[PDB]
Amino acid sequence: GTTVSGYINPDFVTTSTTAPIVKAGFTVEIVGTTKSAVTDSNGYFEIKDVAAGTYTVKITKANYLTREIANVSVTADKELSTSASPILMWAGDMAIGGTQDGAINLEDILEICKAFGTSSTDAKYQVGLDLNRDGAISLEDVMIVAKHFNKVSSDY
């Protein structure tokens, strides 16, 4: 096999503090195989020893809209994206009751608004609702969702 690598970045503004928290933890899977990897704090993934062929690459993380990149031809070592031009992932398909619905819509916004105006020093704050991980659940989080409002995975 050969190595498939790349970069994933959440599609919102981050700082030196929040970037490593939110760039880590995306699972990248080569569909129909056992091959996968999780992104590091720079958003980098590396999947070792992938057999030559054409694949769908599936990217998931809690509270992000799943992305599938179809028709990826692997014939040798392959970099899907760079740090300068990463694969963007859209925050705000919220797991409600443990389940995401595969769409970004008003239900996602209102799930966050249940804790509108809280900060991490408040008992009612939940880190999963603080999409940008700045310690506040605020209009900024709502606007992150609104950026990709009314979208499904096929819109990537």
Partner 1 sequence: ESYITMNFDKNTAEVGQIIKATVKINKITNFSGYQVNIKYDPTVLQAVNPKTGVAYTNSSLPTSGELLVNEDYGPIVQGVHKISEGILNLSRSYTALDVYRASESPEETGTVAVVGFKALQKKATTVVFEHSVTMPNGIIGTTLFNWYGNRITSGYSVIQPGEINSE
Chain residues that interact with Ca ion, rule: CB under 5 A: 93, 101, 103, 108, 130, 132, 134, 136, 141
89 binds, among Ca ion, partner 1, none (CB under 5 to 8 A by kind): none
Report the residue number, 32 or 102, with the smaller CB distance to partner 1: 102
Report the residue number, 21 or 152, with the smaller CB distance to partner 1: 152
Least Å distance, CB 67 to partner 1, is 16
CB distance 74 to 4 below 8 Å: yes
Beta bridge partners of 36: 29
Q: Is 22 in the site for partner 1 (CB under 8 A)?
A: no
152 binds, among Ca ion, partner 1, none (CB under 5 to 8 A by kind): partner 1
Which runs of consecutive H residues, i.e. helices, occur in the chain?
A: 19-23, 106-113, 139-147
How many residues bind to partner 1 according to rule CB under 8 A? 21
Nearest-angstrom CA–CA distance, 105 and 20: 27
Element (H, E) at 38: strand 36-38
- For residue 121, the one-letter residue type is T
Tokens of 98: 């443990």
Q: Is 122 in the site for partner 1 (CB under 8 A)?
A: no
